[PDB]
């Protein structure tokens, strides 16, 4: 598809060069209306050109507009732009013939997305769920735009929990050295180890011996750690499979041997002060220092986060690095980023390093999301409850109508996981998020449940008239898509904004504007469908008299874009109802 904003930039750029050839890189400021009053796009360059009058110049640009395919009409009110109908029509044909795609860039820049980040054998909460959903969808956006996307799970696989865990495994399964033991539920095993630590003397000493031996790579210490981490992987993979998430595991352990070099470099450059035996680093604009070495000579999360960002700048040679982490870690990551700058590992004008914040999760009462009480509610409990309530809806009354293959999973899971992903993403990530099954699962308004129904219905209009795929692909090649009726014209122009919308999110990482657009697209479809006959039937007999093929094609163009938006957001359709 064409990005109209980019196309308009070129069209107006030509006009400015022909009207003012001495200006060799003038600002080309194109934005969608802002309606309110008539106009599809606005060009705001006249004011830019003024300082480097406004009305005279606008009209001069206007009168030097080159021949083009997209502009019907222009007015000075700024320069309002109205698109041509034949342009939009042909663009609709093109996406049906060529498929939904963004315009390709000349390079495949490397983008790292860092998201999900569970700490091993500890509880995985709604904060992790957010990071997982937001991160996955950001990764899909960048992949759909032609970037080289590296999805990294920075898993907590090198923390002090492993002393306890390994000491427990030695007692519980002493032949782990020879045969892989049935560890079972990893969360249970942890609380057992934790209890023992809190209530015993020698176990506690042995847990500290185990951390020392794990750091120094004692085989039969590392072995224990691998087996625990393998159990963690199986469990997390159930979660990621269900949510359709792809991640390359790159834990804390990966950067362990690089941390000594980090401390050395910060010292050698004169950036380290000593306080009560702790090594600290002050960073520009920041009141709170990083702490890179503790009193006991141990490294911290500041040390490992510096190791990882340097690895990702130096070894991966990333053009962009995205950290999907809660608003609580904001100051920490700005501090990490400013330390990286200070020491000269990257330049923010050349390499994009970005923290994509998300707000705290609340209950319906507007207080923090907690169990009763007061432990953190698990993901498997949330996903389990969503699957339960999803079924309950289906139970009224989709009983013998649907196969249990196409019901007890397909429909159930689409709606449960789709509404969980969508309710989150449909709100601005930075804000406090209210987790509400009732609101997310509602069949009306802006919900995955509404949109899944809408998609199915849009797809059903051509098939229920006995038009098949071949007829539709044939129609697409030889049919002029008419846009005479106002609701055909609203819908056609709405469809063509998809690349614009995605282009903006590639800059600012606010996926809620994609959910806004998809909802607007669904709404514009329903206004089209309500006001324009797709099939025409006899009032009395209900006999099929005419099929309006171009209007079938409008349905299909909407399906195509919606399907793509769904994919980016992680919503899977199921059509069997």
Curated annotation (Swiss-Prot):
<feature type="binding site">
    <location>
        <begin position="117"/>
        <end position="119"/>
    </location>
    <ligand>
        <name>L-arginine</name>
    </ligand>
</feature>
<dbReference type="GO" id="GO:0006418">
    <property type="term" value="P:tRNA aminoacylation for protein translation"/>
</dbReference>
<dbReference type="Pfam" id="PF05746">
    <property type="entry name" value="DALR_1"/>
</dbReference>
<dbReference type="InterPro" id="IPR014729">
    <property type="entry name" value="Rossmann-like_a/b/a_fold"/>
</dbReference>
<feature type="binding site">
    <location>
        <position position="305"/>
    </location>
    <ligand>
        <name>L-arginine</name>
    </ligand>
</feature>
<keyword id="KW-1026">Leukodystrophy</keyword>
<feature type="region of interest" description="Interaction with tRNA">
    <location>
        <begin position="446"/>
        <end position="460"/>
    </location>
</feature>
<dbReference type="GO" id="GO:0005654">
    <property type="term" value="C:nucleoplasm"/>
</dbReference>
<keyword id="KW-0225">Disease variant</keyword>
<keyword id="KW-0436">Ligase</keyword>
<dbReference type="InterPro" id="IPR009080">
    <property type="entry name" value="tRNAsynth_Ia_anticodon-bd"/>
</dbReference>
<dbReference type="Pfam" id="PF03485">
    <property type="entry name" value="Arg_tRNA_synt_N"/>
</dbReference>
<dbReference type="GO" id="GO:0034618">
    <property type="term" value="F:arginine binding"/>
</dbReference>
<keyword id="KW-0547">Nucleotide-binding</keyword>
<dbReference type="InterPro" id="IPR035684">
    <property type="entry name" value="ArgRS_core"/>
</dbReference>
<dbReference type="GO" id="GO:0005737">
    <property type="term" value="C:cytoplasm"/>
</dbReference>
<dbReference type="GO" id="GO:0004814">
    <property type="term" value="F:arginine-tRNA ligase activity"/>
</dbReference>
<dbReference type="GO" id="GO:0005730">
    <property type="term" value="C:nucleolus"/>
</dbReference>
<dbReference type="InterPro" id="IPR008909">
    <property type="entry name" value="DALR_anticod-bd"/>
</dbReference>
<dbReference type="GO" id="GO:0005524">
    <property type="term" value="F:ATP binding"/>
</dbReference>
<dbReference type="InterPro" id="IPR001278">
    <property type="entry name" value="Arg-tRNA-ligase"/>
</dbReference>
<keyword id="KW-0963">Cytoplasm</keyword>
<keyword id="KW-0067">ATP-binding</keyword>
<feature type="binding site">
    <location>
        <position position="301"/>
    </location>
    <ligand>
        <name>L-arginine</name>
    </ligand>
</feature>
<dbReference type="GO" id="GO:0017101">
    <property type="term" value="C:aminoacyl-tRNA synthetase multienzyme complex"/>
</dbReference>
<keyword id="KW-0007">Acetylation</keyword>
<comment type="similarity">
    <text>Belongs to the class-I aminoacyl-tRNA synthetase family.</text>
</comment>
<dbReference type="InterPro" id="IPR005148">
    <property type="entry name" value="Arg-tRNA-synth_N"/>
</dbReference>
<dbReference type="GO" id="GO:0070062">
    <property type="term" value="C:extracellular exosome"/>
</dbReference>
<feature type="binding site">
    <location>
        <position position="128"/>
    </location>
    <ligand>
        <name>L-arginine</name>
    </ligand>
</feature>
<dbReference type="GO" id="GO:0005829">
    <property type="term" value="C:cytosol"/>
</dbReference>
<dbReference type="GO" id="GO:0005634">
    <property type="term" value="C:nucleus"/>
</dbReference>
<comment type="subunit">
    <text>Interacts (via N-terminus) with AIMP1 (via N-terminus); this stimulates its catalytic activity. Interacts (via N-terminus) with LARS2 (via C-terminus). Monomer. Part of a multisubunit complex that groups tRNA ligases for Arg (RARS1), Asp (DARS1), Gln (QARS1), Ile (IARS1), Leu (LARS1), Lys (KARS1), Met (MARS1) the bifunctional ligase for Glu and Pro (EPRS1) and the auxiliary subunits AIMP1/p43, AIMP2/p38 and EEF1E1/p18. Interacts with QARS1. Part of a complex composed of RARS1, QARS1 and AIMP1.</text>
</comment>
<dbReference type="GO" id="GO:0045296">
    <property type="term" value="F:cadherin binding"/>
</dbReference>
<dbReference type="GO" id="GO:0006420">
    <property type="term" value="P:arginyl-tRNA aminoacylation"/>
</dbReference>
<dbReference type="InterPro" id="IPR036695">
    <property type="entry name" value="Arg-tRNA-synth_N_sf"/>
</dbReference>
<keyword id="KW-0030">Aminoacyl-tRNA synthetase</keyword>
<dbReference type="Pfam" id="PF00750">
    <property type="entry name" value="tRNA-synt_1d"/>
</dbReference>
<dbReference type="GO" id="GO:0000049">
    <property type="term" value="F:tRNA binding"/>
</dbReference>
<protein>
    <recommendedName>
        <fullName>Arginine--tRNA ligase, cytoplasmic</fullName>
        <ecNumber>6.1.1.19</ecNumber>
    </recommendedName>
</protein>
<comment type="function">
    <text>Forms part of a macromolecular complex that catalyzes the attachment of specific amino acids to cognate tRNAs during protein synthesis. Modulates the secretion of AIMP1 and may be involved in generation of the inflammatory cytokine EMAP2 from AIMP1.</text>
</comment>
<dbReference type="InterPro" id="IPR001412">
    <property type="entry name" value="aa-tRNA-synth_I_CS"/>
</dbReference>
